[PDB]
Amino acid sequence: MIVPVRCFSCGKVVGDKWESYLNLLQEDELDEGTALSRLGLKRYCCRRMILTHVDLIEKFLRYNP
Amino acid sequence: ANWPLPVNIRRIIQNAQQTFHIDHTKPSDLTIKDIVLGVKDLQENLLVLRGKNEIIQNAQRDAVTLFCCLLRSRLATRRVLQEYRLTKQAFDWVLSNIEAQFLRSVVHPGEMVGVLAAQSIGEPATQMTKVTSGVPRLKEILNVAKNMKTPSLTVY
Amino acid sequence: TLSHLRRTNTPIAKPRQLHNTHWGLVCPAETPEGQACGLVKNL
């Protein structure tokens, strides 16, 4: 679907870091670990929260209705 | 020696030497007649059948034979006086308690024990995982197989 | 969906047992538990 607004486990906001994450991956050409680190995601629950996410909405938007 | 029987006598005795707090350094106020004739008269009350004819009484003495062997074995004079060191009061309490528990241990008429047996065999037969054993053998037995898979002869 | 689209059914000496020849042709793990065990297979 879409990037979860907050981390399930602890509650840290992560819904504002998805685009920044993608940019950190494509623009600065970083790896997932460093990208997740620079976004202040030290705990591996949030780290997971972003790394593990699949942005399915980007396919959902391919339909016209 | 270890066999399932009604009335746990050991627990009754160890409850006697706990309820009356008898010390192991004091002469018992019992008597040979008290113990011997007492135990001998206790067996007369251990009733399972209650007829008045010869047949039913014979069946009665037959049904309680084993438990009476246990009784005589546990409540022998030497054992009672030396090993148990019971008093008169404690001994009488033991006899009364044994009789009571024995009467409690009797099966209640109306007990659907056919179904009880069938389930007591069928249920553990569910948790079952060189002759044929286990479930297939049980099936052979119950079906009374004319031609069992592993006919064996044990010759001594 | 994928699992259902690659399924095998068998009507009716030991058709349930995972045979040696099933190697690389039929999944050794994927089979329903119970009555249809070993009969219903997956490619």
Partner: protein, 160 residues
């Protein structure tokens, strides 16, 4: 086999003996062989025991075998249950099976025997032979929806 034998001094001691196990059964001619003790010979076939040594020995062997099946799994069932089963299998005079050929051919109630395996044919031959159902059977009062003579209903309650 290892065997517990009463010592002359009193206690029980492990006295090991050579025992002949066997693939194959022919009790009628093996026990009459000079050299072995024909009083302790045994076979897992309670059929041959029942045919050679009698219905009681057949009962003992039957129980021995059922109990063997139970205890082989490591489990334990009290004696009276298996004893009840074997006794019921053995009281008819021979070895009555626990199938539609065995106890279902007994002279009990029609409805009871019809509540198991062969249903309709039992009722057919019951109607053909004009059988009387005592209705003191469990399943028969189950069908009639009445308080069967079971435990609580094994008696009557009146006033005095």
């Amino acid at each position: 086999y290892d065997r517990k034998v009463p010592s002359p001094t009193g206690e029980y001691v492990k006295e090991p003996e050579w025992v002949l196990e066997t693939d194959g059964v022919n009790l009628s001619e093996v026990m009459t062989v000079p050299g072995i003790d024909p009083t302790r010979i045994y076979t897992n076939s309670f059929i041959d025991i029942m045919e050679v040594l009698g219905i009681e020995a057949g009962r003992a062997a039957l129980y021995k075998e059922v109990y063997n099946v139970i205890a082989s799994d490591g489990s334990y069932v009290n004696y009276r249950h298996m004893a009840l089963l074997v006794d019921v299998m053995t009281t008819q005079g021979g070895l009555t099976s626990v199938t539609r050929h065995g106890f279902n051919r007994s002279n009990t109630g029609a409805l009871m025997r019809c509540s198991f395996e062969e249903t309709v044919e039992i009722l057919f031959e019951a109607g053909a032979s004009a059988e009387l159902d005592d209705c003191r059977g469990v399943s028969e009062n189950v069908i009639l929806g009445q308080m069967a003579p079971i435990g609580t209903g094994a008696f009557d309650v009146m006033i005095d």
